[PDB]
Amino acid sequence: GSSGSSGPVSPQQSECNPVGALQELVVQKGWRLPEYTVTQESGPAHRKEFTMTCRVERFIEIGSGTSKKLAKRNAAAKMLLRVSGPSSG
């Protein structure tokens, strides 16, 4: 069989971020970690911009950010709503 239990854990006060949120939701939906891959790349040298897209089990959302680390978030954040329900855009 199988057993499920999280347990009472104190609320860890930490800055707000999508990358850290999508990780919590997924578990609730029963999905695996999101996939981060750079699709397109544009922008000059002084200001580089990478277009990263988030590939979810049954969801997808393209994002962009000056840097790779940022891009990931740009995509994740958007995904939050996408998977949530209402899509303002």
mmCIF file of C-alpha atoms in Angstrom:
data_model
loop_
_atom_site.group_PDB
_atom_site.id
_atom_site.type_symbol
_atom_site.label_atom_id
_atom_site.label_comp_id
_atom_site.label_asym_id
_atom_site.label_seq_id
_atom_site.Cartn_x
_atom_site.Cartn_y
_atom_site.Cartn_z
ATOM 1 C CA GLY A 1 0.000 0.000 0.000
ATOM 2 C CA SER A 2 1.035 3.588 0.685
ATOM 3 C CA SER A 3 0.861 6.280 3.367
ATOM 4 C CA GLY A 4 0.817 10.068 3.189
ATOM 5 C CA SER A 5 1.757 12.572 5.883
ATOM 6 C CA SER A 6 3.452 15.976 5.972
ATOM 7 C CA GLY A 7 3.405 16.856 9.659
ATOM 8 C CA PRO A 8 3.080 20.187 11.503
ATOM 9 C CA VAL A 9 6.000 22.401 10.485
ATOM 10 C CA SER A 10 6.557 25.986 11.626
ATOM 11 C CA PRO A 11 6.094 28.642 8.909
ATOM 12 C CA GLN A 12 9.599 29.420 7.653
ATOM 13 C CA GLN A 13 9.594 33.154 6.929
ATOM 14 C CA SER A 14 11.437 33.557 3.626
ATOM 15 C CA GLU A 15 11.376 36.040 0.745
ATOM 16 C CA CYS A 16 8.745 35.512 -1.950
ATOM 17 C CA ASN A 17 9.690 33.699 -5.158
ATOM 18 C CA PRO A 18 8.024 31.602 -7.893
ATOM 19 C CA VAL A 19 10.810 29.040 -8.276
ATOM 20 C CA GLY A 20 10.197 28.154 -4.641
ATOM 21 C CA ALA A 21 6.423 28.201 -5.052
ATOM 22 C CA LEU A 22 6.027 26.023 -8.145
ATOM 23 C CA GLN A 23 7.995 23.423 -6.186
ATOM 24 C CA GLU A 24 5.303 23.379 -3.500
ATOM 25 C CA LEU A 25 2.316 23.371 -5.855
ATOM 26 C CA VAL A 26 3.658 20.599 -8.090
ATOM 27 C CA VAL A 27 3.889 18.262 -5.099
ATOM 28 C CA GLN A 28 0.244 19.067 -4.367
ATOM 29 C CA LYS A 29 -0.729 18.365 -7.976
ATOM 30 C CA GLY A 30 1.414 15.241 -8.127
ATOM 31 C CA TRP A 31 3.929 16.407 -10.720
ATOM 32 C CA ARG A 32 7.724 16.383 -10.981
ATOM 33 C CA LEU A 33 10.177 19.287 -10.838
ATOM 34 C CA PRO A 34 9.774 21.782 -13.711
ATOM 35 C CA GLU A 35 12.044 21.668 -16.762
ATOM 36 C CA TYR A 36 14.228 24.695 -17.492
ATOM 37 C CA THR A 37 15.696 25.090 -20.978
ATOM 38 C CA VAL A 38 16.799 28.110 -23.008
ATOM 39 C CA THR A 39 14.850 28.428 -26.257
ATOM 40 C CA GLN A 40 15.887 31.779 -27.726
ATOM 41 C CA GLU A 41 18.675 34.239 -26.928
ATOM 42 C CA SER A 42 18.687 37.925 -27.871
ATOM 43 C CA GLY A 43 20.196 41.179 -26.643
ATOM 44 C CA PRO A 44 23.501 43.073 -26.940
ATOM 45 C CA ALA A 45 26.649 42.534 -24.876
ATOM 46 C CA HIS A 46 26.029 45.272 -22.307
ATOM 47 C CA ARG A 47 22.511 43.914 -21.807
ATOM 48 C CA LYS A 48 22.077 40.211 -22.566
ATOM 49 C CA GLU A 49 18.664 38.534 -22.471
ATOM 50 C CA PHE A 50 17.931 34.801 -22.470
ATOM 51 C CA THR A 51 14.533 33.334 -23.346
ATOM 52 C CA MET A 52 13.890 30.344 -21.086
ATOM 53 C CA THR A 53 10.708 28.269 -21.302
ATOM 54 C CA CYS A 54 9.189 26.192 -18.502
ATOM 55 C CA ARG A 55 8.079 22.747 -19.670
ATOM 56 C CA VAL A 56 5.543 21.316 -17.221
ATOM 57 C CA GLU A 57 3.991 17.846 -17.303
ATOM 58 C CA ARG A 58 0.827 19.136 -18.974
ATOM 59 C CA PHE A 59 1.676 22.845 -19.028
ATOM 60 C CA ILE A 60 4.066 25.217 -20.795
ATOM 61 C CA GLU A 61 5.097 28.855 -20.393
ATOM 62 C CA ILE A 62 7.805 30.854 -22.165
ATOM 63 C CA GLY A 63 9.865 33.354 -20.197
ATOM 64 C CA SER A 64 12.774 35.763 -20.584
ATOM 65 C CA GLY A 65 15.355 37.379 -18.325
ATOM 66 C CA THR A 66 18.573 39.379 -18.550
ATOM 67 C CA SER A 67 20.310 36.334 -17.077
ATOM 68 C CA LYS A 68 19.641 32.589 -17.096
ATOM 69 C CA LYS A 69 18.976 32.442 -13.353
ATOM 70 C CA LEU A 70 16.424 35.241 -13.711
ATOM 71 C CA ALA A 71 14.770 33.808 -16.822
ATOM 72 C CA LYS A 72 13.867 30.609 -14.972
ATOM 73 C CA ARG A 73 11.889 32.705 -12.489
ATOM 74 C CA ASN A 74 10.279 34.824 -15.209
ATOM 75 C CA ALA A 75 8.851 31.618 -16.677
ATOM 76 C CA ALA A 76 7.974 29.888 -13.407
ATOM 77 C CA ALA A 77 6.075 32.885 -12.038
ATOM 78 C CA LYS A 78 3.852 33.038 -15.120
ATOM 79 C CA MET A 79 3.326 29.278 -14.890
ATOM 80 C CA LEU A 80 1.892 29.722 -11.393
ATOM 81 C CA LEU A 81 -1.210 31.419 -12.794
ATOM 82 C CA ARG A 82 -1.260 29.297 -15.949
ATOM 83 C CA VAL A 83 -1.586 26.105 -13.906
ATOM 84 C CA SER A 84 -3.598 27.855 -11.195
ATOM 85 C CA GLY A 85 -6.541 28.822 -13.381
ATOM 86 C CA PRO A 86 -7.065 32.438 -14.493
ATOM 87 C CA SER A 87 -4.583 33.763 -17.052
ATOM 88 C CA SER A 88 -4.360 37.561 -17.072
ATOM 89 C CA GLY A 89 -2.905 38.584 -20.420
#
